[PDB]
Amino acid sequence: GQRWELALGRFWDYLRWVQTLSEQVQEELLSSQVTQELRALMDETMKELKAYKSELEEQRLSKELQAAQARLGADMEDVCGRLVQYRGEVQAMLGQSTEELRVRLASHLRKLRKRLLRDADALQKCLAVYQ
Questions:
Q1: 82 in a known ligand binding site
Q2: 114 labelled as ligand-binding?
Q3: Dist. CA 21–CA 83, nearest whole Å
Q4: Burial grade of 108 (CB within 10 A; 0-12, 13-18, 19 or more)
Q5: 112 is in an annotated binding site
Q6: Left (φ > 0), alpha (ψ -120 to 50) or beta: where does 96 sit?
Q7: I need a labelling partner for 45 at 20 to 30 A (CA). Which of 12, 28, 76, 120 fits?
């Protein structure tokens, strides 16, 4: 752990589940439910991150720190954004098969997830060299 790490961990595990695009994920994607639960998990992570830095400051780099955290937050909204786009695109098919849409969502989500993980590893390092 580390609190903010454990919160980001819950965001991460929820996202790995969404990636499966199983039947329950799909029901929950056409509802606001997923981007809904994702937002809460994201907000929890940034909250705990904020508190961690405040605490850390009790024991250039700052600027690099704010930006690394900013990337994290933006990766999470890019994920939510893409998940919103799939819903509309599904609505747009008016009933047609969503199989193709899903293969392409999965490919894209994987890349968005790879960026998130690389930015989280980076924020983690900044925090250290500043730990």
A1: no
A2: yes
A3: 11
A4: middle
A5: yes
A6: beta
A7: 28
